[PDB]
Amino acid sequence: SNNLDSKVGGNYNYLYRLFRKSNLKPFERDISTEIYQAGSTPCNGVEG
């Protein structure tokens, strides 16, 4: 679909989840935008 989906520098309508706490079950949808926290320090919703 390169001739259709591609638009200039990118298309924000198509997004993916780069990180997740665990493995989602098959056909499981979770649109939560909670920041991924790998350590014990609270992220407070900001990267770091």
- Distance between CA 46 and CA 35 in Å, rounded? 7
Candidates 12, 14, 19, 27; binder of another protein (CB under 8 A) is 27
34 binds another protein (CB under 8 A): no
5: tokens are 């989906």
The C-alpha atoms of residue 19 and residue 33 are separated, in whole angstroms, by 11
Smallest gap from Cβ 3 to another protein, in A, equals 32
Least spacing, CB of residue 31 vs another protein, in Å: 12
CA atoms within 13 A on the CB side of 6: 5
31 is an interface residue for another protein by CB under 8 A = no
| Residues lying near another protein in the complex (CB under 8 A) | 25-29
